[PDB]
Design a binder for this molecule. Sequence first.
Ligand SMILES: *SC[C@H](NC(=O)CC[C@H](N)C(=O)O)C(=O)NCC(=O)O
Ligand SMILES: *SC[C@H](NC(=O)CC[C@H](N)C(=O)O)C(=O)NCC(=O)O
Lengths: 201, 201
Amino acid sequence: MKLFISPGACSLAPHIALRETGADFEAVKVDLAVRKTEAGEDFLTVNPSGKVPALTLDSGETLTENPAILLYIADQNPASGLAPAEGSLDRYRLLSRLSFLGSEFHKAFVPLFAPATSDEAKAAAAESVKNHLAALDKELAGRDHYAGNAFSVADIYLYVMLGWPAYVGIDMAAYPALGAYAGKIAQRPAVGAALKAEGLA
Amino acid sequence: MKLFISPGACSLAPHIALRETGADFEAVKVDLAVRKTEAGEDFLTVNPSGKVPALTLDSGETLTENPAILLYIADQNPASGLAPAEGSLDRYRLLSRLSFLGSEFHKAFVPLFAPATSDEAKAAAAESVKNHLAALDKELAGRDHYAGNAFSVADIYLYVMLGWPAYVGIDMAAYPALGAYAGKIAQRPAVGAALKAEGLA
Ligand SMILES: *SC[C@H](NC(=O)CC[C@H](N)C(=O)O)C(=O)NCC(=O)O
Ligand SMILES: *SC[C@H](NC(=O)CC[C@H](N)C(=O)O)C(=O)NCC(=O)O
């Protein structure tokens, strides 16, 4: 099983998830600029969009999209309990959470990670990020978990993105509940293990 | 079961899905301009973000985000087969498609539907929508269905989005495979029934 990643990118979530489950896999780093793997291979052959994360199974089939990859990882080792049992109703809540993160929150940042983005555009994106953080901060105030009451891949996914604002000049001190929320997660050994492996710890 | 929608919006997907499964439900139209449902309620109470679609389940909860809602709708009637069964690898393939459609394709349109958007921003959005359309066309020229081997909620989700390009200045005659693809789905009884119900204004 190969998980294609890029240091600190959205692919960190799947990375942390695989380390939480202990499943075997090799992390293959990708140079998103040249769109080539560390080994030097052409990543476009793996995922035509050139984006990470990408998960290639032992069968040879590759899976893309964080929500799909995260749920897949969790389901291969249910003992880890990173996702509600298949068929359960809390599963849709999780899906909804993963989908909000990938389609709304994650996208609010994109303009801030773009080279030729107008000042007003950046100002607009920064404004959207903050509005999301404020809503997320209010939602998690007094709560430890984003989807339900157990630790899940949605928490891992959100944790990762919560490390992006400070990256784009936004001070998290304005969101106490998020800082507390993220702080707990940052301590799990799998988080530090994934980070160290990417060379960011 | 209640589905909150707005004529022709992204909420048309779940609407068609509920008709495909033959479920008993009610579609509550929402005036997005003032966040009020045709039932009088302040829609922000049903869904704090003020966005459709939103699905209040027969078990009491309100679900948001198309991928989650669409998957839930399909699962309620396994005899309809609108999504692969839990436990199958094919389910993740579906989740990946729903995720791409919701996080990449759908989002590429936003700037084109926004009022204050500048000409440059619109031009950039158009180019992004066109780039996805070209990839999707090439992709669907080789298969019958978008996700897997049979008609699924991913096809309904994509079909709805394929109904937007032309109205914002992107000639769909440029994508023959997509045109043929949408033309078949457009004929389904559930699709036309949803259009007939939404077209009344
Ligand atoms: S976070 C890094 C970028 N990946 C994505 O945006 C994946 C988005 C999907 N919607 C998902 O995984 O859910 C990335 O790889 N960008 C390429 C670049 O060249 O920056
Ligand atoms: S298409 C109509 C708008 N809804 C969404 O964009 C929902 C996006 C989620 N990511 C999803 O459902 O997957 C909408 O309701 N906009 C509000 C408005 O005032 O136009």
